[PDB]
A paper describes a structure:
The most important mechanism of resistance to β-lactam antibiotics is mediated by β-lactamases, which catalyze β-lactam hydrolysis, thus inactivating the antibiotics. β-Lactamases are broadly divided into four classes: those in classes A, C, and D employ a hydrolysis mechanism involving a nucleophilic serine residue, while class B comprises the metallo-β-lactamases (MBLs), which employ metal ions in catalysis. MBLs catalyze the hydrolysis of virtually all classes of β-lactams, with monobactams being the exception. Despite relatively low amino acid sequence identity, all identified MBLs share an αβ/βα sandwich fold as well as a conserved active site, which binds two or, less commonly, one zinc(II) ion. The active sites of the MBLs are characterized by mobile loops, including a hydrophobic L3 loop (residues 60 to 67, according to the standard class B β-lactamase (BBL) numbering scheme) and a hydrophilic L10 loop (residues 223 to 242), both of which are involved in substrate binding.
[name] and [name]-38 belong to the [name]-1 cluster and differ from [name]-1 by 5 and 6 residues, respectively (Ala130Lys, His224Leu, Glu225Ala, Ser228Arg, and Lys291Thr, with an additional Ala316Val substitution for [name]-38). To explore the structural features contributing to the observed differences in inhibition of the [name] variants, a crystal structure of recombinant [name] was determined to a 1.5-Å resolution (P21 space group), having 2 molecules per asymmetric unit. The overall fold of [name] has the canonical MBL αβ/βα sandwich structure, with two zinc(II) ions (3.5 Å apart) being bound in the active site located in a shallow cleft formed by the interface of the two β-sheets. Despite having identical sequences, the [name] L3 loop was closer to the active site than observed for [name]-2, as was reported previously for [name]-4 and [name]-31 (19, 32). The replacement of Glu225 with Ala225, as in [name] and [name]-38, may enable more flexibility of the Arg228 side chain, contributing to the observed differences in substrate/inhibitor binding. Additionally, the hydrogen bond formed between the Glu225 side chain and the main chain of Leu265 is disrupted in the [name] structure with the replacement of Glu225 with Ala225.
Author numbering: 32 to 261
The structure:
Amino acid sequence: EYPTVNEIPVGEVRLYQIADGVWSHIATQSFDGAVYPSNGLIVRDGDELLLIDTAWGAKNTAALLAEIEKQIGLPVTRAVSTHFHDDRVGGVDVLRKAGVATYASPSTRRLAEAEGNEIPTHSLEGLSSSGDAVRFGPVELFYPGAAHSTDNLVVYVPSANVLYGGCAVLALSRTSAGNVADADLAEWPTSVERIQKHYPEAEVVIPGHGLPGGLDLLQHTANVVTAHKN
Ligand SMILES: [Zn+2]
Ligand SMILES: [Zn+2]
Ligand SMILES: [Zn+2]
């Protein structure tokens, strides 16, 4: 029942309910000759919402806000981008203009600036080194170490044991490590191991692109990245 890339035209956004007050959002985008799906998260924060990642671009993110209004009907007040690529920060300006407080680590902000991407405005403190974790409303933010990018964060929702891996975690469908332009292939398996050790009770694991699954998405990722690296 999870929305697939084949089912979502570019410009449309789907929501998928994972638990009471937890949704993923799914969008698609034209990239490097293909159409890719992309996931983010929505977590209820009292009578407000916390958004994890944009929907990969301004038009997609505007559609996301519209979809949230008609499906959930609570305001997005804060957003966190989990690394500096456009599928995570592309749309930050739309969010900011809509009244949303956009957040990222200092590293992500720096890298977004350097890449010419939109820059989340507010800085997350306490995430500078491997293994660091902080609470942020209804979620925990965790820096597992460099992986898909040097700055990538993962997000855990303890109310539902939902682990949002973002792009540091690969879907089972991936046969390569994907876009590795900014990746640390040497560190990535160790960073996955940190996630495995810190979140052993995760029920659901959501990758940055493609279908959610269980904990074996983590070991899958380590396996693919190690094979790639070799
Ligand atoms: Zn990325
Ligand atoms: Zn602000
Ligand atoms: Zn990605």
